[PDB]
Amino acid sequence: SNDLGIIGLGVMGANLALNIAEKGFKVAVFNRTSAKTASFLKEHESEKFAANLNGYETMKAFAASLKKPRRAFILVQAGAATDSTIEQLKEVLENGDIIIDTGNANFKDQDKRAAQLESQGLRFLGMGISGGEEGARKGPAFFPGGTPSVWEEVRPIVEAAAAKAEDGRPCVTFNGKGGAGSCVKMYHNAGEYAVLQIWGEAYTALLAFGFDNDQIADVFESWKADGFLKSYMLDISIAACRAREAAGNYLSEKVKDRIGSKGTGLWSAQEALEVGVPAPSLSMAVISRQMTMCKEERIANCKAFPNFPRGPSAEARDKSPNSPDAKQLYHAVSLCIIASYAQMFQCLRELDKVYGFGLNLPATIATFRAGCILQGYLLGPMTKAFEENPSLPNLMDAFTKEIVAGLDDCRQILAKLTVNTAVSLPVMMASLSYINAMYTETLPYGQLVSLQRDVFGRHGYERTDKDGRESFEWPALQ
Amino acid sequence: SNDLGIIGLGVMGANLALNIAEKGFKVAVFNRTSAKTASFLKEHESEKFAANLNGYETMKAFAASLKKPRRAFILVQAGAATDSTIEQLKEVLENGDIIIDTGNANFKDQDKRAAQLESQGLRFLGMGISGGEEGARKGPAFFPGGTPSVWEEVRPIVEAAAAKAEDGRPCVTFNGKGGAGSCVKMYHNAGEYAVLQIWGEAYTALLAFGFDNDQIADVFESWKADGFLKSYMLDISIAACRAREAAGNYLSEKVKDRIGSKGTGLWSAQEALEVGVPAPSLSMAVISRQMTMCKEERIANCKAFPNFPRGPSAEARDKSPNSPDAKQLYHAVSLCIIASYAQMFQCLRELDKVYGFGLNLPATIATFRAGCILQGYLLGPMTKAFEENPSLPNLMDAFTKEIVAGLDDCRQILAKLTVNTAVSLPVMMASLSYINAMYTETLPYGQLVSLQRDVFGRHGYERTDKDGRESFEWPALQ
Numbered sequence: 001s002n003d004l005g006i007i008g009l010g011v012m013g014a015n016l017a018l019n020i021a022e023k024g025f026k027v028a029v030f031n032r033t034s035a036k037t038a039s040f041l042k043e044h045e046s047e048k049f050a051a052n053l054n055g056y057e058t059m060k061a062f063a064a065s066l067k068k069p070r071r072a073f074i075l076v077q078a079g080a081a082t083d084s085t086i087e088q089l090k091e092v093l094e095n096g097d098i099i100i101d102t103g104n105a106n107f108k109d110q111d112k113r114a115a116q117l118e119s120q121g122l123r124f125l126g127m128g129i130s131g132g133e134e135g136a137r138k139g140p141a142f143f144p145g146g147t148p149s150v151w152e153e154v155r156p157i158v159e160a161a162a163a164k165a166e167d168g169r170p171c172v173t174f175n176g177k178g179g180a181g182s183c184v185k186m187y188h189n190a191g192e193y194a195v196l197q198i199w200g201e202a203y204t205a206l207l208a209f210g211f212d213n214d215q216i217a218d219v220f221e222s223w224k225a226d227g228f229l230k231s232y233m234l235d236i237s238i239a240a241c242r243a244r245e246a247a248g249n250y251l252s253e254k255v256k257d258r259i260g261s262k263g264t265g266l267w268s269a270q271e272a273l274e275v276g277v278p279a280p281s282l283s284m285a286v287i288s289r290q291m292t293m294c295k296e297e298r299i300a301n302c303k304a305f306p307n308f309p310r311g312p313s314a315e316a317r318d319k320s321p322n323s324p325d326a327k328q329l330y331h332a333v334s335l336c337i338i339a340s341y342a343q344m345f346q347c348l349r350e351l352d353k354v355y356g357f358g359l360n361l362p363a364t365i366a367t368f369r370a371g372c373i374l375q376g377y378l379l380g381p382m383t384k385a386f387e388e389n390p391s392l393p394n395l396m397d398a399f400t401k402e403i404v405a406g407l408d409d410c411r412q413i414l415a416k417l418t419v420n421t422a423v424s425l426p427v428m429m430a431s432l433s434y435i436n437a438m439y440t441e442t443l444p445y446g447q448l449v450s451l452q453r454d455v456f457g458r459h460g461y462e463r464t465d466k467d468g469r470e471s472f473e474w475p476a477l478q
Numbered sequence: 479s480n481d482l483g484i485i486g487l488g489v490m491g492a493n494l495a496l497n498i499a500e501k502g503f504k505v506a507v508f509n510r511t512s513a514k515t516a517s518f519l520k521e522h523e524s525e526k527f528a529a530n531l532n533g534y535e536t537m538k539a540f541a542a543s544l545k546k547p548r549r550a551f552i553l554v555q556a557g558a559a560t561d562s563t564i565e566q567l568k569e570v571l572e573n574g575d576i577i578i579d580t581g582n583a584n585f586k587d588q589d590k591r592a593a594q595l596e597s598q599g600l601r602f603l604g605m606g607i608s609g610g611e612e613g614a615r616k617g618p619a620f621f622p623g624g625t626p627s628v629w630e631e632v633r634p635i636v637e638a639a640a641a642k643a644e645d646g647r648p649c650v651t652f653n654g655k656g657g658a659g660s661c662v663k664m665y666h667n668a669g670e671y672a673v674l675q676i677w678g679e680a681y682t683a684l685l686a687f688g689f690d691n692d693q694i695a696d697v698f699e700s701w702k703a704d705g706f707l708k709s710y711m712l713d714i715s716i717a718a719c720r721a722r723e724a725a726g727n728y729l730s731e732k733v734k735d736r737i738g739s740k741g742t743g744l745w746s747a748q749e750a751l752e753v754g755v756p757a758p759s760l761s762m763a764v765i766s767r768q769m770t771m772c773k774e775e776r777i778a779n780c781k782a783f784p785n786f787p788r789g790p791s792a793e794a795r796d797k798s799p800n801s802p803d804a805k806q807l808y809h810a811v812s813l814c815i816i817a818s819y820a821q822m823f824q825c826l827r828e829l830d831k832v833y834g835f836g837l838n839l840p841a842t843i844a845t846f847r848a849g850c851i852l853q854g855y856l857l858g859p860m861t862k863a864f865e866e867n868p869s870l871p872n873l874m875d876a877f878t879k880e881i882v883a884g885l886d887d888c889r890q891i892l893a894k895l896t897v898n899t900a901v902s903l904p905v906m907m908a909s910l911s912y913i914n915a916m917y918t919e920t921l922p923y924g925q926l927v928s929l930q931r932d933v934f935g936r937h938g939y940e941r942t943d944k945d946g947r948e949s950f951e952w953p954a955l956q
């Protein structure tokens with residue numbers, strides 16, 4: 001008899017089984033292809049553990065070995081595979097047993113699974129996993145959301161394998177009812193989507209100045225020593241630049257510029273649009289990936305028009321990390337992460353009102369500190385910012401001093417990138433527009449477009465002096 | 479007995495009845511509030527065609543007075559109102575009767591509504607109308623899509639009341655099966671969304687230079703005389719700017735900068751994201767409207783942060799249309815509509831592949847020339863561009879000479895606006911990122927982010943030198 005069950009021996013599924021088994025819990029593993037299950041026990045037999053790891057080839061034996069109430073963890077591809085696995089388990093579980101879906105699924109679908117499963121005496125919990133392969137093996141951050149009773153039942157198992165923060169608290173906190181955990185996980189990736197693109201966009205800017213791959217990460221390493229931008233994404237960005245093939249060439253040169261995506265980044269952008277929360281940086285991150293996927297279109301576009309005006313190339317004479325071009329981008333990069341995280345948090349607060357999770361916002365920022373993708377220094381002030389003022393109008397209001405210090409310095413270098421080079425900067429320029437619009441009392445295009453709609457649609461417009469709607473009568477124009 | 483029925487006596491519904499009545503067809507009208515139906519006949523009883531206008535207070539009398547097979551046109555609010563009307567019509571029509579939904583609905587629901595009505599012997603058609611209040615009465619453009627058999631019954635009515643182009647063709651063409659007609663209408667507004675924001679953004683740019691409300695439309699009038707930007711949307715922009723109250727103050731000063739939205743702009747951005755077509759300008763137009771709706775956020779943000787660095791103000795001493803800033807902005811504006819229209823058609827072509835509309839694209843662009851919101855000179859070359867090369871990779875490839883002429887001039891003026899002023903330019907700058915990205919064979923941020931995903935997620939990456947996917951072995955970073 002085992003204590004827990006994990007289904008899906010993928011990158012996240014395989015390492016998670018190793019983690020809990022190392023914790024002393026008896027882990028039962030199952031995968032759709034039984035060959036993987038046999039190989040899993042074969043390679044991981046020389047460890048100081050895995051006597052608790054017993055693999056099974058049939059589903060009936062997988063369920064029967066679990067302590068009642070059963071706790072089955074699902075780590076398969078989100079969507080059809082998760083739906084396929086849950087219905088397969090419905091014939092091998094009993095009343096009161098707990099199923100846990102940990103794949104990066106949609107929170108809308110998460111509530112549907114809860115209703116369909118509670119009708120047959122089954123219990124469901126929706127939680128998200130972040131940290132990647134290494135985070136899975138060492139310790140990830142957990143984002144659980146659903147019925148509060150189920151979370152406490154699996155609380156000891158989750159916290160043991162969870163990442164341990166600097167202070168000592170495990171990086172897991174209950175988020176709320178429904179798909180609150182997956183909603184947080186969905187927007188956890190949304191923040192990851194933008195910042196990962198921000199680092200890549202700054203990578204393009206440095207390359208636009210003739211910086212070869214080595215000095216680009218040299219600039220990044222100096223920014224890490226500053227401490228403000230110290231983050232896991234900075235670590236992987238530096239590692240990507242330093243990557244070199246066996247032939248001596250940089251790895252980044254041979255990599256095709258096509259970025260795959262799986263759901264979570266896309267779904268969060270649509271929902272933010274649907275709820276009405278302005279998230280240009282979050283939406284632009286997804287669109288930027290879509291641009292890279294149309295590689296055949298780009299090749300045809302360049303071939304059909306090769307005389308593209310790319311602007312006057314402006315190589316930077318100083319290629320050291322102390323160069324003004326490097327220094328200006330540091331303030332440009334930092335404010336874009338601040339802007340992007342603000343939009344990520346802005347949707348989450350509005351999402352809490354609409355779907356009624358009962359989200360504990362200050363603790364959810366604190367659960368990012370270690371083990372997850374968004375881990376870094378910036379989570380300190382951001383957790384503190386919403387702890388001091390839970391009613392903060394915008395996350396940037398906590399970082400006023402950093403904005404004043406480098407908002408101007410940010411503006412010229414992007415303009416310098418714009419005028420001198422033809423490098424696309426979708427997310428960074430979206431963030432700058434978000435900062436300006438959210439900090440200007442009156443946006444002139446808001447007034448004019450309101451009039452424009454009234455001209456043809458007679459939709460009316462709002463007035464500043466008095467409440468209500470008024471429509472001025474326009475002359476015929478067709 | 480009448481031949482056609484119009485349901486919904488709104489701004490669009492009333493004028494469409496006037497159009498068809500002028501054409502000689504007997505129009506039967508019905509509105510949910512019968513007071514509107516009774517009032518409608520009172521003011522339009524002195525017209526030369528008020529014998530053709532017969533109002534009905536009950537739907538049963540409304541249906542019984544229609545020529546068999548019945549053709550009822552629905553022009554009510556999209557969503558719940560249309561669903562209520564459709565179910566109400568199911569009890570008063572018989573087999574072979576045709577229902578036409580003309581509200582700006584979702585094309586996904588349009589195919590679903592057709593299936594639900596064929597199960598009771600009813601026939602459905604999804605069509606969109608654009609042109610506003612004035613366009614509806616003097617002839618709008620129609621975008622019908624659905625069962626091809628249904629189209630022929632309503633062909634004489636739609637083409638007769640349609641706008642007449644310069645050559646003479648009515649601005650109506652069958653688009654395809656399912657919700658193809660409403661899908662064109664949904665992205666018709668998406669193109670309208672961006673350019674309306676582009677004009678408002680150019681209004682912001684000129685206002686940031688001290689041009690004041692009056693001289694801004696004077697600059698706009700010069701661009702109208704140029705002929706390149708000559709369009710209905712340009713005409714209403716000048717009219718909106720020129721609007722002045724009796725007290726002498728500009729109308730734009732008293733208008734609250736909050737922009738409402740009704741479905742089509744939001745839905746098109748989500749669908750473009752869903753299918754994977756990169757349309758940042760279309761998405762940014764919706765996002766820009768969301769920014770203007772957050773009035774409470776900006777007011778609180780400005781109070782919580784009054785020391786906003788607005789940059790070095792650079793007033794243009796020359797406020798004439800011949801000013802270099804105005805001339806550069808003309809080239810900056812023009813290429814962004816070119817970019818935005820390309821994405822609108824790029825989404826439409828990919829949407830045709832996914833849903834199998836069978837879209838006749840060159841004729842679908844040809845229905846835009848007159849009667850719709852986006853009508854103007856620029857639609858001419860675009861119709862010709864896709865006629866010469868139906869497999870054209872991107873509409874920007876057709877406008878090579880205009881791109882070469884002012885792509886650089888567009889880049890500098892945006893940089894001047896960025897450095898000197900803190901005015902948000904979401905849509906225009908999003909288009910510039912689209913222009914740059916679509917014409918570079920290899921995007922460096924696409925390469926770097928591809929490595930970033932492999933570092934933590936082990937997702938792999940594609941290589942330029944050889945086919946396949948590779949995963950580089952990374953050192954521990956947690």
Ligand SMILES: NC(=O)C1=CN([C@@H]2O[C@H](COP(=O)(O)OP(=O)(O)OC[C@H]3O[C@@H](n4cnc5c(N)ncnc54)[C@H](OP(=O)(O)O)[C@@H]3O)[C@@H](O)[C@H]2O)C=CC1
Pocket residue numbers: 457485486487488489490491492509510511512514553554555556558559560562563580581582583607608609610667740851
């Ligand atoms: N965005 C654009 O560019 C364009 C928009 N359109 C679309 O055409 C359609 C009609 O536009 P418009 O003329 O302005 O009218 P409205 O969209 O303002 O809707 C008014 C009509 O809908 C009726 N109706 C309204 N609400 C309900 C409800 N819950 N239940 C049942 N019936 C209801 C109203 O009845 P009553 O008033 O008696 O209560 C009235 O007849 C819209 O969908 C619009 O999106 C058309 C052209 C251009």
